[PDB]
């Protein structure tokens, strides 16, 4: 059997970066040079193990972590990065074994007038722990007042929505990102 990378890297609808999708890859044979040699990815650099030599290595389980970010902050999907996405949406530990695939999806995830489905967490009380998922749409407390679930001054919805256009810049275009993690069932 082959590991099901096909609906990880070619799903018709990814998830937002605050609600980053996670799939567990277990009990299968994985080919990684089919991922490596495709050249449809603008970003594929690997930390902890070289991409050519990780086809020959085995792990117990592998997490495939998929979301959609703007193309400027694919830099933030790295060990030891700071920003909105690296602190309030998706944090990688410093001892990261695993690697990150990012490719452009302007032709799919961006529509004329604005594909506003993708959101990111803008306000959060503290930095995320590595591989931590937050969903909670409680009204953020910018001030010192009982907001009581209704917005207004100093009571903000914590989820800013991405604005994606087919006319804007390359770094402002939606980049689908798949993050692979490594931990003996999943070999090459």
């Amino acid at each position: 059997n082959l590991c099901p990378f096909g609906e990880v890297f070619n799903a018709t609808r990814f998830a937002s970066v605050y609600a980053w999708n996670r799939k567990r890859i277990s009990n299968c044979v994985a080919d990684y040079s089919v991922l490596y040699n495709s050249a449809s990815f603008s970003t594929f650099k690997c930390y902890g193990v070289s991409p050519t030599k990780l086809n020959d290595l085995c792990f117990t389980n592998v997490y495939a972590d998929s979301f959609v970010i703007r193309g400027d902050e694919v830099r933030q999907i790295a060990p030891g990065q700071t920003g909105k996405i690296a602190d309030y949406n998706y944090k990688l530990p410093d001892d990261f074994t695993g690697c990150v695939i990012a490719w452009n999806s302007n032709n799919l995830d961006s529509k004329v007038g604005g594909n506003y489905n993708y959101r990111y967490r803008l306000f959060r009380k503290s930095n995320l722990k590595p591989f931590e998922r937050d969903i909670s749409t409680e009204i953020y407390q910018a001030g010192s007042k009982p907001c009581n679930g209704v917005e207004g001054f100093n009571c903000y919805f914590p989820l800013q929505s991405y604005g994606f256009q087919p006319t804007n810049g390359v770094g402002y275009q939606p980049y689908r990102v798949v993050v692979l993690s490594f931990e003996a069932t999943v070999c090459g």
Partner: antibody
């Protein structure tokens, strides 16, 4: 009652140190995107620094390494550790609460810093 | 970084003519441009965020528009209190860079 009272600005030596302040009210510094903006005469109004909720510190390329934003969480007091000052830092320094890391929604009255001999 | 150029660098308008202020960009900022109003001896109060949204206490007289790389601020009725310096910044790339500001003055 929304205030941002700034203190600590004044004459300091060029090659000195400053420890500015911004005493907030009605919003907590520790959980808001706070930022420092300087207005120098002759040049434009220029962004200096920003701090995220809990978060992290980001600086401009003209101030990177020599400046340091460091809030306090016992009272709402945003600081700006301002070390190795040069004479191109003669500017009115504003603390400014941001919405996101987007726009300076509310501003303090500003405090002026003169660095000369 | 993005260099904003407020083109009417000083504009003297009679009290009520629907003055119009503009700033262009060195790059593309989608709707990502703010406007600020700095009166004499005051902090620059925010006027319009996202190039089209009057924030809080900002009346309907201020009518900023434009997107991409060409931007407009429209001051409608021009009381004496509108004599200030009007800035614009971008959101899209770090650092957030202001314009040179438009000094608008009223005529008596």
């Amino acid at each position: 009652e929304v205030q941002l009272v700034e203190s600590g600005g004044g004459l300091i030596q060029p090659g000195g140190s400053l420890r500015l302040s911004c005493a907030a009210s009605e919003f907590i510094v520790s959980r808001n995107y706070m930022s420092w903006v300087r207005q120098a005469p002759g040049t434009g109004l220029e962004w200096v620094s920003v701090i995220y909720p809990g978060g992290s510190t980001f600086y401009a390329d003209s101030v990177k390494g020599r400046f340091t934003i460091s809030r306090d969480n016992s009272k709402n007091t945003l600081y700006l550790q301002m070390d190795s000052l040069r004479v191109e830092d003669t500017a009115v320094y504003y603390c400014a609460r941001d919405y996101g890391d987007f726009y300076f929604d509310y501003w303090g009255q500003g405090t002026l810093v003169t660095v000369s001999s | 970084e993005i260099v904003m150029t407020q083109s009417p660098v000083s504009l003297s308008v009679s009290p009520g003519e629907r003055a119009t202020l503009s700033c262009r960009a060195s790059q593309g900022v989608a709707s990502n441009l703010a406007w600020y109003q700095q009166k004499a001896g005051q902090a620059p109060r925010l006027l319009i965020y996202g190039a089209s949204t009057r924030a809080t206490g900002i009346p309907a007289r201020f009518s900023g528009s434009g997107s991409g790389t060409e931007f407009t601020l429209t001051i409608s009725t021009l009381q004496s209190e509108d004599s200030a310096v009007y800035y614009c910044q971008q959101y899209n790339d770090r650092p957030r860079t202001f314009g040179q500001g438009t000094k608008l003055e009223i005529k008596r």
